[PDB]
Design a protein around this ligand. Structure first.
Ligand SMILES: COc1ccc2c(O[C@H]3C[C@H]4C(=O)N(C)CCCC/C=C\[C@@H]5C[C@@]5(C(=O)NS(=O)(=O)C5(C)CC5)NC(=O)N4C3)cc(-c3nc(C(C)C)cs3)nc2c1F
Ligand SMILES: [Zn+2]
Lengths: 182, 13
């Protein structure tokens, strides 16, 4: 990898629940990827062009606890398992890849950067197959090109007997397509 | 009902 990553837990369980109910998060926000949670489950969200994008199957309809109360979904594209909120101030946004590379890097929930070989528009095979548990909880995590630019957000995996052989992701082009629907 | 909450972050470089 030419890219590295590290994680920082900013909230605990009790404070999490609380903030979920009020919808008011005054904690300072940093970084390009946020670790995100509802009461039941947890997953990632990625920032691209000022919008925080995550998966619909983790956050469905829900708002995002923000510094001035809850934030409504700007974008909701059930068809592509994609939702988006306006990035809380402080969230450093990634920008889309323009180079067309096939040498991708998926950044996971535990801050692993793992090589992915670009296969289609929304598809890429893992160079070293991992266990599924190694990947679970990373939906809404970013796929990056070698220069650290965004090509897509992690949606799903293809696997057999608990070992992940390939990854599906929403292409960054579909995010701008969703943003092209006023 | 409830909101999604930011319980952490991943920094890149
Ligand atoms: C445009 O085409 C697609 C493609 C896939 C879609 C889709 O895929 C699922 C399939 C399932 C799957 O692959 N397996 C179970 C097997 C391997 C597991 C691979 C490991 C990690 C995977 C990334 C990951 C994940 O981390 N999920 S998560 O973070 O844990 C979460 C549950 C908290 C959100 N996602 C993941 O595992 N899966 C996503 C789901 C949904 C929707 N789901 C719902 C509700 C009702 C559940 C509404 S729409 N739409 C999808 C869709 F429109
Ligand atoms: Zn690029």
């Amino acid at each position: 990898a030419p890219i590295t990553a590290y994680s920082q837990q900013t909230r605990g369980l009790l404070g999490c629940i609380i903030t979920s109910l009020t919808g008011r998060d005054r904690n300072q926000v940093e970084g390009e990827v946020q670790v995100v949670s509802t009461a039941t489950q947890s997953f990632l969200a990625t920032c691209v062009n000022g919008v925080c994008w995550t998966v619909y199957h983790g956050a469905g309809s829900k708002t995002l606890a923000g510094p001035k109360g809850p934030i409504t979904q700007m974008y909701t594209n059930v068809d592509q398992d994609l939702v988006g909120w306006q990035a809380p101030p402080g969230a450093r946004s990634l920008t889309p890849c323009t180079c067309g590379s096939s040498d991708l890097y998926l950044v996971t929930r535990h801050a692993d950067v793992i090589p992915v070989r670009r296969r289609g528009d929304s598809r890429g095979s893992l160079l070293s197959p991992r266990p599924v548990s190694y990947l679970k909880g990373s939906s809404g995590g970013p796929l990056l090109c070698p220069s650290g630019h965004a090509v897509g957000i992690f949606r799903a995996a293809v696997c057999t007997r608990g070992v992940a052989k390939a990854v599906d992701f929403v292409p960054v082009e579909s995010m701008e397509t969703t943003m092209r629907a006023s | 009902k409830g909101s999604v909450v930011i319980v952490g972050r991943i920094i890149l470089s």
